[PDB]
Amino acid sequence: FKIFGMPLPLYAFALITLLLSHFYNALPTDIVGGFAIMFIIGAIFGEIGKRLPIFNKYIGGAPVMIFLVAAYFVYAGIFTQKEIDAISNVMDKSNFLNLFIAVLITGAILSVNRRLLLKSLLGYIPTILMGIVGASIFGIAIGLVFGIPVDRIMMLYVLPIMGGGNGAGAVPLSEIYHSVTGRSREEYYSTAIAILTIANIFAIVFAAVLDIIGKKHTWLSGEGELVITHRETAVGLVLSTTCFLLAYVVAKKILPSIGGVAIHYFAWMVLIVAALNASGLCSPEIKAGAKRLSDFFSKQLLWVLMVGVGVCYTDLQEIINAITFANVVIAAIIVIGAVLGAAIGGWLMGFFPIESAITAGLCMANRGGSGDLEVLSACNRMNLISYAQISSRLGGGIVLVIASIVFGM
Amino acid sequence: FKIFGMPLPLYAFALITLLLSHFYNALPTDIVGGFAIMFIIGAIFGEIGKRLPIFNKYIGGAPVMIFLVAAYFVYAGIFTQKEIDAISNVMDKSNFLNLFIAVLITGAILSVNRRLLLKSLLGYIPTILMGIVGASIFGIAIGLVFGIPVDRIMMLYVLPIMGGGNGAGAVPLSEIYHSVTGRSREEYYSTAIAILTIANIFAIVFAAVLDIIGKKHTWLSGEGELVREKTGQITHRETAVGLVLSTTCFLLAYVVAKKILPSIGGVAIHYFAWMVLIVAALNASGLCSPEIKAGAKRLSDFFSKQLLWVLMVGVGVCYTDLQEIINAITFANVVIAAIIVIGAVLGAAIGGWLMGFFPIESAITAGLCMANRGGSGDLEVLSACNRMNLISYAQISSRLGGGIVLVIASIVFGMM
Ligand SMILES: OC[C@H]1O[C@@H](O)[C@H](O)[C@@H](O)[C@@H]1O
Ligand SMILES: OC[C@H]1O[C@@H](O)[C@H](O)[C@@H](O)[C@@H]1O
């Protein structure tokens, strides 16, 4: 048998090396050192989670293993500080996370027809709002079951969960909280960041549950649907970065906010890439290159990404500081409110309920971009990255406008 | 026609974006921001270097353009501080340079037969020594033509040039200078780092000259070769496993050169040198199936053919301070340095010819790759003669051959 397309004997060589670097405490805190550890660790736990009987269900087993396992390694101090640093240097300083998402978006968007583009976006945004309504309705419902005043349910539970994640919700929602109340950002942030991560774990769990239910009741699922020389693949990489650059320059210095909403650079990228598709500036050869590149990331490096995601974007200590029976239940139900909210809305709009609940439901309640990858990898619908981003970025910018209003009153 | 396989209209989109990021001064100082700029800049100047007859000869011209051009952009302050930072963050903090070399080495070594491995290394090291001798003989010869005492020619000119580059020569040769003399490291380093970079530019130039001469006089050249069962399939997995092996092998080598076997004897073995022995061992062990062994090759191709232009943009930024060069571009140093390089060329040419290697390739691997700025240099040189597949050999000289210069140094320095 083979591991991660590596035969056992060979994997041993690497697994041995990992441990030599580990116990000798010798590791370069850079790309090389990072991918080295991440590839090996991800490989084993990927396979393990790929074949755990109960633990591996559908396709959403493999990644969730690496993801959760990696977090347990940080919390239990299993990683050394240099190892955490190496991985962190790849995910943040070097910023592999964005690149990864950037590659995906480009590859996913450049593969579809131009005619089909504008058809979706018009019916999608309403679905997102439908999800929020359900997220609020259920939250308040269960909230009063816990004897918790409505305002808090919206300010400390609903809004932050549906928020566009750490940078997009906790970073700015604490800012709006301080601007309107005057109370410390920390007071809010700490509670928000903690609870949103709880829900993020539920989102990833229900993503696999809807997968099972989707393949059990085909009528609800769309089965992954809502509605060449290297040079070609290399050009895909160029377009992935260059498109992200443009979007960045737009959200920072040109068109940071269209109106009362602040448009996150990833949201612009979607409109930039989509525009680039419709412009047909990219030949079908190149448009494939972007697809093929996207595959390489989503199929080879997905395990690696999870090792990084389970390290940086999952502080298990802060979760524990808020894992009172109350928060665990309240948070979960809010997520289910989002599921049913986006399911109903999408069904009415013409989308498949299962995919609608993931893209316009779970992808809202998750920890934004890091979250989307965590969720989408759990339902094996990684090809919906583009949609997931709309909710986390644009749909996140929506939560802010709503937040100011609710916070104000 | 197409700028880096991109039609002119599309390239415009990117080239426009680059300039928007530039003038608005908005750029993420990370991988994404880096590759974005590097890909675009490299693309145009890559094409341009090749297009001009005088500017480019054969396939040699493309990289040297990006390389030199990129340095001129830093010196002339054409790049913004954030842009230099972005590129620097990719090359150093993120350490793309090593990865790149790591991928190459792995792909090059895992492609050859196991029987053929040990045949070369035994005849190579002597050739390196032959190159040094010629590098010293010529240096002293021209040195006395400039009325410069021999000791200095060896301490401030020869040794540092042949040194294993910045980290390997200037960083440690100034250390040996201070241990034996007692005089400041700066005094040495500043002069050494300056002059070695001068020679590094000559090395890259003669690499293309030997290319022309090699294809003009085929008898001297091996056409990419120093020395005179079947893949069934390729999977990304297979290519992906190549990437794993590239990193995991570098890790092991690193753990060996730091905590296990830093120095075999009087020589300190740089981690890259170990990697060569680790990968070579891994080949002979056959732990990797031919499918995987190809994956490493294919991965190597992707870097050496797609990302080579990108690398140069980074190499021309970080590892080429044009201001310190100017601080030592006296007619004297320019000439003395150049001739030392030519001494290395002829030294490694003669030696290799006697050992059984092709003179042209021998002069590049055991000659110019010694006098260059180590690893950054090898890539600069090997891309100039289009013999990128000799990375493995170039590394032996820059790392192991560099560890040799140190032992020699302590003796010469001690002698005073
Ligand atoms: O739903 C239409 C299309 O949208 C794209 O963004 C996704 O990448 C495809 O999987 C999907 O077919
Ligand atoms: O010279 C023998 C072989 O050495 C390897 O390291 C190179 O990658 C090959 O190009 C060459 O054929």
Author numbering:
A (entry chain B): 21 to 247, 263 to 444
B (entry chain A): 21 to 248, 258 to 445
Article passage:
The final models showed that two crystal forms of KpCitS were obtained in the citrate-containing droplet. One crystal form (form 1), refined at 4.0 Å resolution, contains an outward-facing KpCitS homodimer. In the outward-facing state, the hairpin loops are located close to the membrane/periplasm interface, which appears to favor the entry of external substrate and ions (left). In the outward-facing state the bound citrate is partially exposed to the periplasmic space. However, it is unlikely that it can escape backwards because it is secured by strong hydrogen and electrostatic interactions. In the outward-facing conformation, L408 and I121 are in close proximity, and serve as a latch governing access of substrate to the cytoplasm. In addition, M417 seems to act as a plug preventing substrate exit.
